[PDB]
Design a protein around this ligand. Structure first.
Ligand code: HX5
Length: 189
């Protein structure tokens, strides 16, 4: 359960004081965006540090499934976001004061807001779209993360570059809206 993640965050995300756990939050979501099933023949991932110190990861993959999970009684996307079972977005969700989820799948835009891993409403259709993919934007909880509270572009940049070489064909963009720095990592060897 998510309550166990909030009680002992160190266990699930790593060190919550030296900044390493804070940045693992980002990498955990990125890994899911990389591991996502392709929608077309390529994948693009866009990592954005927003000017309110939130991070969003978006991909152009298939989209997290939105249909009602027959056994759980809520959208499959909600199950993924709220259940423990390379640890999962549910952990990131658990340790985020807010998380926004936008899914584009089956011609429809779906949106859901969480607070400390608790959904504020059911996953809802907000409009129409010709695109597909997932967008997770999260604001880390400062009840969890102490001392180092701010994301560091360079740490993100260095890691995504390393990943780039391991994931040929995948376009990885990094954008910092605080000062306008950006990078593009795209290996095709
Ligand atoms: C784009 S962020 C992301 N996160 C998850 Cl949990 C799955 C997928 Cl398909 N993408």
């Amino acid at each position: 359960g998510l309550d166990a993640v909030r009680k002992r965050p160190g266990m699930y995300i790593g060190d919550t004081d030296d900044g390493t756990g804070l940045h693992h939050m980002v990498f955990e979501v990125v890994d899911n965006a990389i591991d996502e099933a392709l929608a077309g023949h390529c994948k693009e991932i866009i990592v954005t540090i927003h000017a309110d110190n939130s991070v969003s990861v978006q991909d152009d993959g298939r989209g997290i499934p939105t249909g009602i999970h027959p056994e759980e009684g809520v959208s499959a996307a909600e199950v993924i976001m709220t259940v423990l079972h390379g640890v999962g977005v549910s952990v990131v969700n658990a340790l985020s004061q807010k998380l926004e989820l936008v899914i584009q799948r089956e011609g429809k835009i779906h949106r859901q807001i969480y607070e400390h891993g608790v959904p504020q409403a059911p996953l809802a259709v907000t409009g129409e779209t010709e695109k597909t993919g997932t967008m997770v934007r999260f604001w880390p909880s400062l009840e969890t993360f102490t001392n180092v509270t701010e994301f560091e572009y360079e740490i993100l940049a260095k890691r995504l570059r390393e990943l780039s070489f391991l994931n040929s064909g995948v376009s990885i963009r990094l954008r910092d809206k605080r000062d306008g720095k950006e990078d593009h990592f795209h290996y095709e060897g």
